[PDB]
Amino acid sequence: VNPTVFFDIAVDGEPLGRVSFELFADKVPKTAENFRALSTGEKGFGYKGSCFHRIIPGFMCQGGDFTRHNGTGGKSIYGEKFEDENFILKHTGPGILSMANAGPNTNGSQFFICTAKTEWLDGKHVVFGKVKEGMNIVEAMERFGSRNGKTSKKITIADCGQLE
């Protein structure tokens, strides 16, 4: 019943591979639906063509700023921001998909894929999904990151949509 979304990742335009996520719509329906709709583009805007602007190896990959491509933009399907839905799910290890924000109830479209357990984010960032296939592609993305988050090559979502 939970939707599955995929990204096809390209590096400087060259295909890298596919990542698919399980979204936990049973527990965070409003948050999951935002990510799902941005992945299909069915509302007229979304992630297709956007980049991962921050990648910290051993920490996380952050993306989803499809308006300014640098961590200062993005928007949700509900408006410029929306509330923290709940904090049922925790940051338990690599592959967790969680919402970036700028304080309480400031979710937009930016998200991060954790590549390590990040328990200090529990109760501060809404967890809403998990990598289902292609964790190895996420690990390959990590090798283009750096300590300060700048990427050595442009990492883009070349295509994205819903599988189930």
From Swiss-Prot:
It is found in: Cytoplasm; Secreted; Nucleus. Changing residue 120 to E: Loss of peptidyl-prolyl cis-trans isomerase activity. PROSITE patterns: CSA_PPIASE_1, CSA_PPIASE_2. Pfam families: Pro_isomerase (PF00160). Transmembrane segments: none annotated. Glycans are attached at residue 107. Belongs to the cyclophilin-type PPIase family. PPIase A subfamily. The keyword Nucleotide-binding does not apply. There is a cross-link at residue 27 (Glycyl lysine isopeptide (Lys-Gly) (interchain with G-Cter in ubiquitin)). One of its GO terms (cellular component) is focal adhesion. Interacts with protein phosphatase PPP3CA/calcineurin A. Interacts with PRPF19 isoform 2 (via N-terminus). Interacts with isoform 2 of BSG/CD147. Interacts with FOXO1; the interaction promotes FOXO1 dephosphorylation, nuclear accumulation and transcriptional activity. Interacts with integrin ITGA2B:ITGB3; the interaction is ROS and peptidyl-prolyl cis-trans isomerase (PPIase) activity-dependent and is increased in the presence of thrombin. Interacts with MAP3K5. Binds cyclosporin A (CsA). CsA mediates some of its effects via an inhibitory action on PPIase. Changing residue 120 to F: 75-fold decrease of sensitivity to CsA. There is a cross-link at residues 27, 81 (Glycyl lysine isopeptide (Lys-Gly) (interchain with G-Cter in SUMO2)). Residues 6-162 form the PPIase cyclophilin-type domain. Acetylation at Lys-124 markedly inhibits catalysis of cis to trans isomerization and stabilizes cis rather than trans forms of the HIV-1 capsid. PPIA acetylation also antagonizes the immunosuppressive effects of cyclosporine by inhibiting the sequential steps of cyclosporine binding and calcineurin inhibition. Acetylation at Lys-124 favors its interaction with TARDBP. The lineage of its organism: Eukaryota, Metazoa, Chordata, Craniata, Vertebrata. This is Peptidyl-prolyl cis-trans isomerase A.
